[PDB]
C-alpha cells in the first residue's frame, strides 16, 4: 500500500505538471447516442472510426460554463482526469476543443449507472453494498493520497462495468487541495454539515459522502431527504439519523462513525486515517487485495448484448451539435 501509493504519486505528479492537450478532432468520431445530460453539456456514445472503438465523449458548451462560472472547475476536471490512473476510475482517452466546446473522450462503461439498478432493484443486501463500498474506499485512499478531494459521490456518478465493478466518472468538482477549501459544491443529499455550514473543509467530506452512499445502497433511500434542498440541509446539520430495522449492528456502527457531525470524531479523518474504516467490523470479510485485483466474486453483473449496446441507460432527447464560425471563449480555456 504505502509503497504502492508512493510509486503512484510520482506518475500523477509528472502528469500533473505536463498535462496533455488536443489529442483528437471531432470528425474522427461518429456520434451515436446521449447517455447522460447536464447543466452545460451531454455525454455521448461515440465511435472512433479509425479503431472501431466506442467511448463516452463529454461535450461542454464553453459559453454555458462561463455563464455558470465553472471555468476553474472544468479546468480541474480535465487536468486531474488525464493525470490519475486506478482500476476504479474511468480512463480519459482524449481531449480537444473547437470554436464552440470542450471534449473529453472517456471509456464507455457498458453496465449503466449504479443509480439505475438500485432504483429498479430497491435496496442492496449488505454483502452487495460492501462489495461496492470497498471499491470506493480504496479509490478515496488513492485520490486523497494525491491531495485530491472528489466531492460528488452519488449513485448517478458510479457506473458498473462488464465485470460488475465500479467506475467513478464525473470529476467536475475534483480538486487538488492541501489545506481547507470553501466552494459550496456537490449534491444536496450528500453534503457534509461543514460544507452547508460554510466553514471551510478538507477530505473529511468524502468520508461523510461515503457514509451516505452505503446508507442509500443498503436501505434503498438517503439518510436525509425532503422535497426541497433547504429541508435536506436542515436534516444534515441536525445530526439525527434513524436506521432501518434491517441494518446489522456492525453496519449501524460503521455508519454512526462515518456520519459524524463532529469531524474530530469522524472515521477517515482520525489519527489512523483510512485504516479505521478498512479495519471496521463490517469490513472484516473484505479482501482488499483481492478487490484491488478484481479477483473477487462480483455479486451482480449487468450483462449487455455487444459493443455499442446502450440498454442500461435511459433515453434522452437528442440535441444537435453546433460549432460556431467564431472561436468562443479562447482565453478562458487556453490551457484546455
Amino acid at each position: 500500500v504505502k509503497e504502492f501509493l508512493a510509486k503512484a504519486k510520482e506518475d500523477f505528479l509528472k502528469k500533473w505538471e505536463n498535462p496533455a492537450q488536443n489529442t483528437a478532432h471531432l470528425d474522427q468520431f461518429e456520434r451515436i447516442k446521449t447517455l447522460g445530460t447536464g447543466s452545460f453539456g451531454r455525454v455521448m456514445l461515440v465511435k472512433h472510426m479509425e479503431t472501431g472503438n466506442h467511448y463516452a465523449m463529454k461535450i461542454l458548451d464553453k459559453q454555458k460554463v462561463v455563464k455558470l462560472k465553472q471555468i476553474e472547475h472544468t479546468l480541474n476536471e480535465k487536468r486531474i482526469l488525464q493525470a490519475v490512473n486506478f482500476p476504479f476510475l474511468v480512463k480519459l482517452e482524449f481531449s480537444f476543443k473547437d470554436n464552440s466546446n470542450l471534449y473529453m473522450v472517456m471509456e464507455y462503461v457498458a453496465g449503466g449507472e449504479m443509480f439505475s439498478h438500485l432504483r429498479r432493484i430497491g435496496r442492496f443486501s449488505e454483502p452487495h453494498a460492501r462489495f461496492y463500498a470497498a471499491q470506493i474506499v480504496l479509490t478515496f485512499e488513492y485520490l486523497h493520497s494525491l491531495d485530491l478531494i472528489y466531492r460528488d459521490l452519488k449513485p448517478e456518478n458510479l457506473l458498473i462495468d462488464q465485470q460488475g465493478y465500479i467506475q467513478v466518472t464525473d470529476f467536475g468538482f475534483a480538486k487538488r487541495v492541501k489545506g481547507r477549501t470553501w466552494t459550496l459544491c456537490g449534491t444536496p443529499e450528500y453534503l457534509a454539515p461543514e460544507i452547508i455550514l460554510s466553514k471551510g473543509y478538507n477530505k473529511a467530506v468524502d468520508w461523510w459522502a461515503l457514509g451516505v452512499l452505503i446508507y442509500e445502497m443498503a436501505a434503498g433511500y438517503p439518510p436525509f431527504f425532503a422535497d426541497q434542498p433547504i429541508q435536506i440541509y436542515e436534516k444534515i446539520v441536525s445530526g439525527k439519523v434513524r436506521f432501518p430495522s434491517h441494518f446489522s449492528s456492525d453496519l449501524k456502527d460503521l455508519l454512526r462513525n462515518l456520519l459524524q457531525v463532529d469531524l474530530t470524531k469522524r472515521f477517515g479523518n482520525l489519527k489512523d486515517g483510512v485504516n479505521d474504516i478498512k479495519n471496521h467490523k463490517w469490513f472484516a470479510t473484505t479482501d482488499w487485495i483481492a478487490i484491488y485485483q478484481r479477483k473477487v466474486e462480483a455479486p451482480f453483473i449487468p450483462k449487455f448484448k455487444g459493443p455499442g449496446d446502450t440498454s442500461n441507460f435511459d433515453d434522452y432527447e437528442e440535441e444537435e451539435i453546433r460549432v460556431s464560425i467564431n472561436e468562443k471563449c479562447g482565453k478562458e480555456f487556453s490551457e484546455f
Binding site: 455558470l68 449534491t187 438517503p222
Partner: peptide, 20 residues
C-alpha cells in the same frame, strides 16, 4: 414507512449538482 415516504417524494430521480 420511510420507503413509502421516499417514493412519494420529489427527489427519487437523478439528482442534480448544486453549482451557484
Amino acid at each position: 414507512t420511510t420507503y413509502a415516504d421516499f417514493i412519494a417524494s420529489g427527489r427519487t430521480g437523478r439528482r442534480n449538482a448544486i453549482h451557484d
